[PDB]
Amino acid sequence: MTSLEIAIIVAIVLVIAIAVGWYLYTTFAAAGQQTGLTATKATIYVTKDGNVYLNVTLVPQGAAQVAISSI
Amino acid sequence: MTSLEIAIIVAIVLVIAIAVGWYLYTTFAAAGQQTGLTATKATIYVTKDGNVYLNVTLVPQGAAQVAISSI
C-alpha cells in the first residue's frame, strides 16, 4: 500500500504499542508494592493492678505503609 | 498533435499533477500528527480524612495537544 498508508498505520501502531508496553510497566510497578505485616515477637504483659498491654515487634513485608484495622 | 494541443494538454496535465502531488504531501503532513497519551507511573494516594487523588505521569505520544475526555 502507498507510503501514506504505511505512515498512518505505523503512527497508530506505535501509539498502541507504546501504550500497552508502559501499561505492562505500570502493572509491574503496582504489583511490586504488594505488602503485609509479619510478627517476630509477642508477649502479653500484665501489671499488678490489672492493666494488660501487648508488647509486639512488627516488620512490614513489602515496600509500603501498612494500615492496621483491628486487633 | 499541433503545439496548440500540446500547450493545452500540458497546462491541464501540469495543474492536475501538481494538485495530486501536494495532496500527497498534505496527507503525509496530516498522518504524521497522529497522537495519543501514554502513562509511565501512577499510584492512587489516599489521605487520612478520606480525600483521594491520583498522581499520574503523562507523556504525549506524537506531536499534538491531546484532549482528555474522561477518566
Residue numbers in the entry:
A (entry chain F), B (entry chain T): 1 to 71
Give sentences copied directly from the paper behind this entry.
We present in this paper the structure of two additional archaeal T4P, one from Pyrobaculum arsenaticum, a neutrophilic hyperthermophile (optimal growth at 90 °C, pH 7) and the other from Saccharolobus solfataricus, an acidophilic hyperthermophile (optimal growth at 75–80 °C, pH 2-3). Although the full spectrum of functions played by archaeal T4P is yet to be uncovered, they are known to mediate adhesion to various biotic and abiotic surfaces, and play an important role in DNA exchange, intercellular communication and biofilm formation. Finally, we show that Pyrobaculum and the Saccharolobus T4P are at the forefront of virus-host interaction and are recognized by two different viruses, likely serving as primary receptors during virus infection. We show that whereas the N-terminal domain is conserved in all bacterial and archaeal T4P-like filaments, the C-terminal domain of bacterial T4P is unrelated to the immunoglobulin (Ig)-like domain shared by archaeal T4P and archaeal flagella.
In contrast, the sequence identity between the pilins from P. arsenaticum and S. solfataricus is only ~18%. In contrast, ~10% of the residues in P. arsenaticum pilin are charged. Interestingly, and in contrast to the S. islandicus and S. solfataricus pilins, P. arsenaticum pilin has a 15 amino acid C-terminal extension that wraps around the globular domain. Within this extension, an intramolecular disulfide bond is formed between Cys139 in the extension and Cys80 within the same pilin chain, which is likely to contribute to the thermo-stability of this pilus. In S. solfataricus, we see clear extra density consistent with glycosylation on seven residues, all serines or threonines. In contrast, in P. arsenaticum only a single density consistent with glycosylation is seen, on Asn55, which would be N-linked glycosylation. First, although T4P of a neutrophilic P. arsenaticum is as hydrophobic as those of acidophilic S. islandicus and S. solfataricus, it does not possess the extensive sugar coating. Instead, T4P of P. arsenaticum is stabilized by an intramolecular disulfide bond, a protein adaptation to high temperatures previously reported in bacteria, archaea and their viruses. Consistent with this prediction, boiling the S. islandicus pili in 5 M GuHCl failed to disassemble the filaments, but under the same conditions the P. arsenaticum pili come apart. Interestingly, Iho670 adhesion filament packs very similarly to S. solfataricus and S. islandicus pili, with an RMSD < 2 Å, while P. arsenaticum packs slightly differently from those three filaments with RMSDs of 3–4 Å. Notably, the crucial N-terminal subunit-subunit interactions in these four filaments are almost all hydrophobic, except for in P. arsenaticum there is a glutamic acid, which may contribute to the slightly different packing compared to Iho670 and other archaeal T4P.
